Amino acid sequence: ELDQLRQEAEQLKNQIRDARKACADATLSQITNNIDPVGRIQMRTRRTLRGHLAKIYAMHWGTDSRLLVSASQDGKLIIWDSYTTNKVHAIPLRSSWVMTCAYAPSGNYVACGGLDNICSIYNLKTREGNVRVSRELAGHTGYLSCCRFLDDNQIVTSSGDTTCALWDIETGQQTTTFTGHTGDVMSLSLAPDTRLFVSGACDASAKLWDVREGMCRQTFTGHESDINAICFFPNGNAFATGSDDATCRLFDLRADQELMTYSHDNIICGITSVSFSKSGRLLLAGYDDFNCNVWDALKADRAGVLAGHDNRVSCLGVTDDGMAVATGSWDSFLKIWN
Amino acid sequence: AIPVIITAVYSVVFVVGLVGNSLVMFVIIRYTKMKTATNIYIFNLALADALVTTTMPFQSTVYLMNSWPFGDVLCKIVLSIDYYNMFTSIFTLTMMSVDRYIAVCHPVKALDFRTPLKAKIINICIWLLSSSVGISAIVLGGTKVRDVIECSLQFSWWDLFMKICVFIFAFVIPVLIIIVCYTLMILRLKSVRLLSGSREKDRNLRRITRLVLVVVAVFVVCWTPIHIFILVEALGSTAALSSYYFCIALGYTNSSLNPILYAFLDENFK
Amino acid sequence: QARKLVEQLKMEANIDRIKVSKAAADLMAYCEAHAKEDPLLTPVPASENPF
Amino acid sequence: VQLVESGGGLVQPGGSRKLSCSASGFAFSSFGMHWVRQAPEKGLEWVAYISSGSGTIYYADTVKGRFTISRDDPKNTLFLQMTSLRSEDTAMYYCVRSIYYYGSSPFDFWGQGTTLTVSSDIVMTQATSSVPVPGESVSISCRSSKSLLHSNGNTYLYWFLQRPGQSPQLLIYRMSNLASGVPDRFSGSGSGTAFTLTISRLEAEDVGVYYCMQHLEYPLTFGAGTKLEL
Amino acid sequence: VSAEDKAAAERSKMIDKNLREDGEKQRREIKLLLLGTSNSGKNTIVKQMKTGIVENKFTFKELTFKMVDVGAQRSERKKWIHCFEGVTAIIFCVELSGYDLQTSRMAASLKLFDSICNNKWFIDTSLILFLNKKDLLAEKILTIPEYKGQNTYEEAAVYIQRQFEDLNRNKETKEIYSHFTCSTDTSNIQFVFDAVTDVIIQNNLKYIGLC
Ligand SMILES: COC(=O)N1CCN(C(=O)Cc2ccc(Cl)c(Cl)c2)[C@H](CN2CCCC2)C1
């Protein structure tokens, strides 16, 4: 009856493992062992940003690398000016229980979402001089954990109903639904060519989806706990995940296996955010131990420590120019570092 | 011999009192500075007590040599500093008592009243109210003369007032309202869970009651004899100077013991 | 169902995988070719730095 | 978006007059507000400015001590008192909304003005006053007295077009950026003290007077204007 | 600093003022989370005061209550329960008519209570415990393995309170406020008032360094 299914599944998963072990001719560390190390990155705070009265759960930079949007629990989406510490906009949210916010590449819209199961799209560059609610996207059963913009009319959302979604903004309808995860999906990252995207979930799994045909192109399984953060390499061929098991792991798409791990014995707390530098050499990860760590992505070394928050670091962001790193935490402050 | 060396209590009470405030200001810079009303109340009380402590040799010299041998401006400045910071310390004790009472017995309105900005404007109003006594001590004071030179409130029925006035506005009203505030606070905490259960909850409640009793007792024992001697020497007519300088020594002992009771017994420092 | 669950995973089973040496070489080449354009590697001078 | 200005009329010299402007269709309290007048046969002239929240109020040198600018945001109205009116105050007054943040477009909307018949600064020089022009390309030059390039890399020049019988409308803000509702055939380019506006493939609704305005420091100064005719 | 930069800074100051004015108003409010079950009576309690998250606001004796219900979340609790780290109190609804009704209702109630009362985020947060179906326990009869007690009224509900209070580990820091619900009168919210008052004093003493 159902005997054939489990046997066939474990057999072809075992041959997937056999092919993966055959393609592991060496490791990243052996090739990168003759690189001069980066050293110590003593990046210091340049701006501190006050005005949030509750804890910050998300931020996202701009393409222009000067504006940034931040979401807090006080029902506030604040659009800042990094250079002058000027509040460009303050958007009151209909629901204060938000975990994600996004900034469109065109600079015309921002996105927000959280426990209300609705992705809200707000319009900035409009008449009447005020930010207005342009779109409400509903159809997810779980909370909205991450959202990223493709274009002014396409968005991608990750939710805690084991699914991802691709929405058309103008019609407000589910263009594509990405299914296959077993646990709740926490993070999301689009490739630079906007054709593929990786998504990390609570089944200790990352999944590479193709946007066009809506098919799970790849599945990577190395972690032991819930994956909370995921980020693409600037190349678009590799990606990096952070989980609750106090480890970051770097995977390749073409090699279809894990490349590197980033861990230390004195860190036992999870990872809330992950990001890369402009060249991808420096992997910045926000931890629960009130600090952000800066690993060398090729050598698995703790290159630097950003220690300026007296609460849980919740969100990270690196500019498209690569000039600065903004860090937001649970102590109602977010800081620019360079 | 003579009971003058026994007034070496004008040293032990002195230096420790300064030390009692010397470690106080560091608490503002080594911990939460002004995020709470209690911290800035402690800071103003410590500053006032240190400025009370500063005028120790200006009385120990008057006791040691039975005259004031300094200038007129020194007499005016020292007496005004003494009166000003005395009233500031008393009113700061009073408003910390009122703040604890408001936090316990009117807790819903304490969500609005117990704002650091409101505490700041109340502290500013307290220092401005004490500025009345400070300025009136500047303008109405001076040094008299008789082979000794004397410093007092030189201007008599006019000295019956500004003695009964400092008694009324500096002793009776603060002690009555701190007694009412603390007894109502204890009566409220008598019927509060996590303090009237079992194990250590009653121990914590009795610790709070002991703190209330000791601060009231320290205030009354360290500000009653000064006022009693002042009234009975303004009204009625060798041992007088000795007893008077034991009394004002106890008045300094209040400034020594005050930052102890209001800073070190506070559980929010560490 | 289980048939679709095994069919999709068998469809993604057969893909062209390059070795880990090619991956490491590509990541090294990408990081080396964009190192001078990374402001977070070396501290930029204050004249050209907006922060 | 509507800015309807009323109160103007004929007044004898030595009088007082109350101008008003009702604002609708936009969040009035978020905008700083400006009064700019134009003489009957001459160019534009800045008069007054009030900030959002009525925090900053600025006047021109020829109206200080006798002009007052105020606002009420619940009633969505802007007000201008004028006292001891001179014959030089005979002008048409325009009420202008402007907002200031990063990437904003100030002086974007201009009201329908109202008439009033009373009977160190940077110099913007627009030397040409009549350029004949069709499907051709035209260029209009403006010049400065001091450089308009601030230390933040932002060149503080604005270009307005006044079609015949119509209020001026914003073409170019900050010397290069093209405003909303404006065709892409307009281009603004300039360096320190020297600026130009290029119109490729001139068509209808291009006839008018073109004004260059600086925004480094109050008082804001316009050029004389350049007229394009068929 | 240029003229437009000065005006932008002035707008930023106005936004700071508006943010402070909103922060004071959100600081005078009280947030409570309903965390019982759909088979417990969460919806009946919120409606007696007069899909997605639901959040109700109502003021009782100069105290605005922000009552949040998260019963429509079919996801892992550990990934969003940290969003309620600093709530004032937890309201937990339990149906007394659940041992002989739909399967494992009482076991689910005790399991959820042991999950929440012993959670790392709610280590000092007091729990308001409502026991529903007070008029239905009297007609339902415990008769269903370790009761060893009689099967009359006015003791089975005491047994249920003892069972729920027995799960309270690490005491002398938090209090369970137990209350039989009366669906007719307003005594539900008064108790919610009183317990919250007992929270604020218990906070305020700490805020004044006396505890
Ligand atoms: C409330 O009872 C009062 O009216 N008192 C206030 C003023 N006091 C003085 O002794 C004035 C004085 C005289 C000479 C000199 Cl050198 C100085 Cl520094 C001060 C007494 C109490 N102070 C002095 C000792 C502790 C605080 C009694």
mmCIF file with all atom_site columns, C-alpha atoms in Angstrom, chain E residues 20-147:
data_model
loop_
_atom_site.group_PDB
_atom_site.id
_atom_site.type_symbol
_atom_site.label_atom_id
_atom_site.label_alt_id
_atom_site.label_comp_id
_atom_site.label_asym_id
_atom_site.label_entity_id
_atom_site.label_seq_id
_atom_site.pdbx_PDB_ins_code
_atom_site.Cartn_x
_atom_site.Cartn_y
_atom_site.Cartn_z
_atom_site.occupancy
_atom_site.B_iso_or_equiv
_atom_site.pdbx_formal_charge
_atom_site.auth_seq_id
_atom_site.auth_comp_id
_atom_site.auth_asym_id
_atom_site.auth_atom_id
_atom_site.pdbx_PDB_model_num
ATOM 1   C CA . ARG E 1 20  ? 6.468   62.101 23.088 1.00 0.00 ? 20  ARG E CA 1
ATOM 2   C CA . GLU E 1 21  ? 2.786   63.077 23.256 1.00 0.00 ? 21  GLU E CA 1
ATOM 3   C CA . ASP E 1 22  ? 1.802   59.686 21.826 1.00 0.00 ? 22  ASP E CA 1
ATOM 4   C CA . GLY E 1 23  ? 4.227   57.884 24.137 1.00 0.00 ? 23  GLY E CA 1
ATOM 5   C CA . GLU E 1 24  ? 2.693   59.357 27.285 1.00 0.00 ? 24  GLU E CA 1
ATOM 6   C CA . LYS E 1 25  ? -0.776  58.256 26.138 1.00 0.00 ? 25  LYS E CA 1
ATOM 7   C CA . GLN E 1 26  ? 0.482   54.747 25.387 1.00 0.00 ? 26  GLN E CA 1
ATOM 8   C CA . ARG E 1 27  ? 2.263   54.730 28.764 1.00 0.00 ? 27  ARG E CA 1
ATOM 9   C CA . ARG E 1 28  ? -0.935  55.425 30.703 1.00 0.00 ? 28  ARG E CA 1
ATOM 10  C CA . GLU E 1 29  ? -2.546  52.257 29.251 1.00 0.00 ? 29  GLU E CA 1
ATOM 11  C CA . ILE E 1 30  ? -2.484  48.671 30.537 1.00 0.00 ? 30  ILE E CA 1
ATOM 12  C CA . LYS E 1 31  ? -1.878  45.660 28.271 1.00 0.00 ? 31  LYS E CA 1
ATOM 13  C CA . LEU E 1 32  ? -3.288  42.228 29.147 1.00 0.00 ? 32  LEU E CA 1
ATOM 14  C CA . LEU E 1 33  ? -3.287  39.074 27.024 1.00 0.00 ? 33  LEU E CA 1
ATOM 15  C CA . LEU E 1 34  ? -6.099  36.535 26.880 1.00 0.00 ? 34  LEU E CA 1
ATOM 16  C CA . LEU E 1 35  ? -4.417  33.166 26.558 1.00 0.00 ? 35  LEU E CA 1
ATOM 17  C CA . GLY E 1 36  ? -7.030  30.510 27.296 1.00 0.00 ? 36  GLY E CA 1
ATOM 18  C CA . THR E 1 37  ? -8.650  28.481 24.525 1.00 0.00 ? 37  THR E CA 1
ATOM 19  C CA . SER E 1 38  ? -11.469 28.637 22.000 1.00 0.00 ? 38  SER E CA 1
ATOM 20  C CA . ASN E 1 39  ? -13.089 25.845 24.039 1.00 0.00 ? 39  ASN E CA 1
ATOM 21  C CA . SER E 1 40  ? -12.519 27.815 27.266 1.00 0.00 ? 40  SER E CA 1
ATOM 22  C CA . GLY E 1 41  ? -14.384 31.121 27.096 1.00 0.00 ? 41  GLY E CA 1
ATOM 23  C CA . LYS E 1 42  ? -11.947 33.793 25.928 1.00 0.00 ? 42  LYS E CA 1
ATOM 24  C CA . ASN E 1 43  ? -14.550 35.394 23.657 1.00 0.00 ? 43  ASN E CA 1
ATOM 25  C CA . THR E 1 44  ? -17.278 35.410 26.315 1.00 0.00 ? 44  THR E CA 1
ATOM 26  C CA . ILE E 1 45  ? -15.119 37.292 28.845 1.00 0.00 ? 45  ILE E CA 1
ATOM 27  C CA . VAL E 1 46  ? -14.175 40.081 26.417 1.00 0.00 ? 46  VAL E CA 1
ATOM 28  C CA . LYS E 1 47  ? -17.782 40.523 25.271 1.00 0.00 ? 47  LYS E CA 1
ATOM 29  C CA . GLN E 1 48  ? -19.129 40.524 28.843 1.00 0.00 ? 48  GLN E CA 1
ATOM 30  C CA . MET E 1 49  ? -17.403 43.846 29.615 1.00 0.00 ? 49  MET E CA 1
ATOM 31  C CA . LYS E 1 50  ? -20.262 45.730 27.921 1.00 0.00 ? 50  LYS E CA 1
ATOM 32  C CA . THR E 1 51  ? -8.146  34.888 11.054 1.00 0.00 ? 51  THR E CA 1
ATOM 33  C CA . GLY E 1 52  ? -5.794  37.221 12.883 1.00 0.00 ? 52  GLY E CA 1
ATOM 34  C CA . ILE E 1 53  ? -5.048  39.037 16.103 1.00 0.00 ? 53  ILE E CA 1
ATOM 35  C CA . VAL E 1 54  ? -7.834  40.872 17.933 1.00 0.00 ? 54  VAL E CA 1
ATOM 36  C CA . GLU E 1 55  ? -7.311  43.694 20.410 1.00 0.00 ? 55  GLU E CA 1
ATOM 37  C CA . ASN E 1 56  ? -9.986  45.443 22.476 1.00 0.00 ? 56  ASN E CA 1
ATOM 38  C CA . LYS E 1 57  ? -9.818  48.749 24.359 1.00 0.00 ? 57  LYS E CA 1
ATOM 39  C CA . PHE E 1 58  ? -12.087 49.830 27.206 1.00 0.00 ? 58  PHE E CA 1
ATOM 40  C CA . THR E 1 59  ? -11.575 52.121 30.201 1.00 0.00 ? 59  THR E CA 1
ATOM 41  C CA . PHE E 1 60  ? -12.769 51.146 33.686 1.00 0.00 ? 60  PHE E CA 1
ATOM 42  C CA . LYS E 1 61  ? -12.374 53.681 36.533 1.00 0.00 ? 61  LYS E CA 1
ATOM 43  C CA . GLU E 1 62  ? -9.711  55.867 34.873 1.00 0.00 ? 62  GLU E CA 1
ATOM 44  C CA . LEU E 1 63  ? -7.678  52.840 33.752 1.00 0.00 ? 63  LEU E CA 1
ATOM 45  C CA . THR E 1 64  ? -7.529  52.050 30.036 1.00 0.00 ? 64  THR E CA 1
ATOM 46  C CA . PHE E 1 65  ? -7.170  48.329 29.302 1.00 0.00 ? 65  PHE E CA 1
ATOM 47  C CA . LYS E 1 66  ? -5.484  46.970 26.163 1.00 0.00 ? 66  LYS E CA 1
ATOM 48  C CA . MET E 1 67  ? -6.842  43.425 26.037 1.00 0.00 ? 67  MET E CA 1
ATOM 49  C CA . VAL E 1 68  ? -5.083  41.350 23.371 1.00 0.00 ? 68  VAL E CA 1
ATOM 50  C CA . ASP E 1 69  ? -6.263  37.941 22.182 1.00 0.00 ? 69  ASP E CA 1
ATOM 51  C CA . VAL E 1 70  ? -4.082  35.684 20.033 1.00 0.00 ? 70  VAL E CA 1
ATOM 52  C CA . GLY E 1 71  ? -6.401  32.691 19.696 1.00 0.00 ? 71  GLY E CA 1
ATOM 53  C CA . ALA E 1 72  ? -6.305  32.674 15.876 1.00 0.00 ? 72  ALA E CA 1
ATOM 54  C CA . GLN E 1 73  ? -2.608  31.716 15.593 1.00 0.00 ? 73  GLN E CA 1
ATOM 55  C CA . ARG E 1 74  ? -1.958  28.222 14.215 1.00 0.00 ? 74  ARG E CA 1
ATOM 56  C CA . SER E 1 75  ? 1.802   28.645 14.561 1.00 0.00 ? 75  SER E CA 1
ATOM 57  C CA . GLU E 1 76  ? 4.575   28.002 17.066 1.00 0.00 ? 76  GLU E CA 1
ATOM 58  C CA . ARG E 1 77  ? 4.012   29.945 20.281 1.00 0.00 ? 77  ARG E CA 1
ATOM 59  C CA . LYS E 1 78  ? 7.733   30.322 21.044 1.00 0.00 ? 78  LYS E CA 1
ATOM 60  C CA . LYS E 1 79  ? 8.283   32.627 18.050 1.00 0.00 ? 79  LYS E CA 1
ATOM 61  C CA . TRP E 1 80  ? 5.784   35.344 19.043 1.00 0.00 ? 80  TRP E CA 1
ATOM 62  C CA . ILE E 1 81  ? 5.257   35.001 22.819 1.00 0.00 ? 81  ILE E CA 1
ATOM 63  C CA . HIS E 1 82  ? 8.298   37.252 23.302 1.00 0.00 ? 82  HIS E CA 1
ATOM 64  C CA . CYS E 1 83  ? 6.175   40.065 21.832 1.00 0.00 ? 83  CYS E CA 1
ATOM 65  C CA . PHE E 1 84  ? 4.350   40.113 25.200 1.00 0.00 ? 84  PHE E CA 1
ATOM 66  C CA . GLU E 1 85  ? 7.403   40.181 27.468 1.00 0.00 ? 85  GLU E CA 1
ATOM 67  C CA . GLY E 1 86  ? 6.372   43.348 29.293 1.00 0.00 ? 86  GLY E CA 1
ATOM 68  C CA . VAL E 1 87  ? 2.606   42.965 29.628 1.00 0.00 ? 87  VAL E CA 1
ATOM 69  C CA . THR E 1 88  ? 0.927   43.870 32.908 1.00 0.00 ? 88  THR E CA 1
ATOM 70  C CA . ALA E 1 89  ? -0.936  40.614 33.557 1.00 0.00 ? 89  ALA E CA 1
ATOM 71  C CA . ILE E 1 90  ? -1.935  37.368 31.857 1.00 0.00 ? 90  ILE E CA 1
ATOM 72  C CA . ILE E 1 91  ? -5.601  36.393 31.726 1.00 0.00 ? 91  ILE E CA 1
ATOM 73  C CA . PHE E 1 92  ? -6.062  32.626 31.409 1.00 0.00 ? 92  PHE E CA 1
ATOM 74  C CA . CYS E 1 93  ? -9.516  31.150 30.798 1.00 0.00 ? 93  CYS E CA 1
ATOM 75  C CA . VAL E 1 94  ? -10.340 27.565 31.789 1.00 0.00 ? 94  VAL E CA 1
ATOM 76  C CA . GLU E 1 95  ? -13.604 25.697 31.204 1.00 0.00 ? 95  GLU E CA 1
ATOM 77  C CA . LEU E 1 96  ? -14.708 23.628 34.200 1.00 0.00 ? 96  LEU E CA 1
ATOM 78  C CA . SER E 1 97  ? -16.949 21.615 31.852 1.00 0.00 ? 97  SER E CA 1
ATOM 79  C CA . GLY E 1 98  ? -13.980 20.130 30.036 1.00 0.00 ? 98  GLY E CA 1
ATOM 80  C CA . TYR E 1 99  ? -13.089 16.844 31.704 1.00 0.00 ? 99  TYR E CA 1
ATOM 81  C CA . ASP E 1 100 ? -16.134 15.013 30.298 1.00 0.00 ? 100 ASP E CA 1
ATOM 82  C CA . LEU E 1 101 ? -16.611 17.198 27.193 1.00 0.00 ? 101 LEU E CA 1
ATOM 83  C CA . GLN E 1 102 ? -14.419 17.221 24.029 1.00 0.00 ? 102 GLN E CA 1
ATOM 84  C CA . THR E 1 103 ? -11.244 15.178 24.270 1.00 0.00 ? 103 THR E CA 1
ATOM 85  C CA . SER E 1 104 ? -8.304  16.283 26.449 1.00 0.00 ? 104 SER E CA 1
ATOM 86  C CA . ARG E 1 105 ? -9.735  19.730 27.198 1.00 0.00 ? 105 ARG E CA 1
ATOM 87  C CA . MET E 1 106 ? -8.644  19.648 30.846 1.00 0.00 ? 106 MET E CA 1
ATOM 88  C CA . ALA E 1 107 ? -5.274  18.100 29.972 1.00 0.00 ? 107 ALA E CA 1
ATOM 89  C CA . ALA E 1 108 ? -4.758  20.785 27.317 1.00 0.00 ? 108 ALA E CA 1
ATOM 90  C CA . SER E 1 109 ? -5.695  23.469 29.863 1.00 0.00 ? 109 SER E CA 1
ATOM 91  C CA . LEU E 1 110 ? -3.162  22.273 32.448 1.00 0.00 ? 110 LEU E CA 1
ATOM 92  C CA . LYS E 1 111 ? -0.508  21.743 29.753 1.00 0.00 ? 111 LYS E CA 1
ATOM 93  C CA . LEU E 1 112 ? -0.976  25.277 28.397 1.00 0.00 ? 112 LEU E CA 1
ATOM 94  C CA . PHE E 1 113 ? -0.929  26.690 31.938 1.00 0.00 ? 113 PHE E CA 1
ATOM 95  C CA . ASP E 1 114 ? 2.297   24.829 32.737 1.00 0.00 ? 114 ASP E CA 1
ATOM 96  C CA . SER E 1 115 ? 3.755   26.167 29.488 1.00 0.00 ? 115 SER E CA 1
ATOM 97  C CA . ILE E 1 116 ? 2.825   29.798 30.197 1.00 0.00 ? 116 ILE E CA 1
ATOM 98  C CA . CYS E 1 117 ? 3.204   30.076 33.992 1.00 0.00 ? 117 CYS E CA 1
ATOM 99  C CA . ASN E 1 118 ? 6.700   28.537 33.838 1.00 0.00 ? 118 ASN E CA 1
ATOM 100 C CA . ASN E 1 119 ? 7.749   30.382 30.674 1.00 0.00 ? 119 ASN E CA 1
ATOM 101 C CA . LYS E 1 120 ? 10.992  32.358 30.675 1.00 0.00 ? 120 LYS E CA 1
ATOM 102 C CA . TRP E 1 121 ? 9.299   35.576 29.541 1.00 0.00 ? 121 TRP E CA 1
ATOM 103 C CA . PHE E 1 122 ? 6.556   35.414 32.196 1.00 0.00 ? 122 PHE E CA 1
ATOM 104 C CA . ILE E 1 123 ? 8.859   34.741 35.166 1.00 0.00 ? 123 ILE E CA 1
ATOM 105 C CA . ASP E 1 124 ? 7.507   37.722 37.154 1.00 0.00 ? 124 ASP E CA 1
ATOM 106 C CA . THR E 1 125 ? 4.202   38.379 35.348 1.00 0.00 ? 125 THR E CA 1
ATOM 107 C CA . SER E 1 126 ? 1.131   37.680 37.464 1.00 0.00 ? 126 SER E CA 1
ATOM 108 C CA . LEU E 1 127 ? -1.606  35.472 36.024 1.00 0.00 ? 127 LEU E CA 1
ATOM 109 C CA . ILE E 1 128 ? -5.303  36.231 36.383 1.00 0.00 ? 128 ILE E CA 1
ATOM 110 C CA . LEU E 1 129 ? -7.036  32.853 36.336 1.00 0.00 ? 129 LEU E CA 1
ATOM 111 C CA . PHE E 1 130 ? -10.692 32.721 35.301 1.00 0.00 ? 130 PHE E CA 1
ATOM 112 C CA . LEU E 1 131 ? -12.629 29.512 35.883 1.00 0.00 ? 131 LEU E CA 1
ATOM 113 C CA . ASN E 1 132 ? -15.669 29.400 33.610 1.00 0.00 ? 132 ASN E CA 1
ATOM 114 C CA . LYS E 1 133 ? -18.805 27.202 33.562 1.00 0.00 ? 133 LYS E CA 1
ATOM 115 C CA . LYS E 1 134 ? -19.520 27.857 37.245 1.00 0.00 ? 134 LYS E CA 1
ATOM 116 C CA . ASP E 1 135 ? -23.228 27.247 36.632 1.00 0.00 ? 135 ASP E CA 1
ATOM 117 C CA . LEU E 1 136 ? -22.433 24.183 34.495 1.00 0.00 ? 136 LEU E CA 1
ATOM 118 C CA . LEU E 1 137 ? -20.185 22.291 36.924 1.00 0.00 ? 137 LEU E CA 1
ATOM 119 C CA . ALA E 1 138 ? -23.151 22.130 39.326 1.00 0.00 ? 138 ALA E CA 1
ATOM 120 C CA . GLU E 1 139 ? -25.207 20.233 36.718 1.00 0.00 ? 139 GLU E CA 1
ATOM 121 C CA . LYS E 1 140 ? -22.442 18.283 34.957 1.00 0.00 ? 140 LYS E CA 1
ATOM 122 C CA . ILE E 1 141 ? -21.576 16.066 37.935 1.00 0.00 ? 141 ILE E CA 1
ATOM 123 C CA . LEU E 1 142 ? -15.039 14.821 39.638 1.00 0.00 ? 142 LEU E CA 1
ATOM 124 C CA . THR E 1 143 ? -16.577 11.669 38.174 1.00 0.00 ? 143 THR E CA 1
ATOM 125 C CA . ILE E 1 144 ? -14.804 11.746 34.749 1.00 0.00 ? 144 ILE E CA 1
ATOM 126 C CA . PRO E 1 145 ? -8.120  8.713  39.035 1.00 0.00 ? 145 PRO E CA 1
ATOM 127 C CA . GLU E 1 146 ? -6.546  10.382 42.081 1.00 0.00 ? 146 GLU E CA 1
ATOM 128 C CA . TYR E 1 147 ? -9.392  12.531 43.433 1.00 0.00 ? 147 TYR E CA 1
#
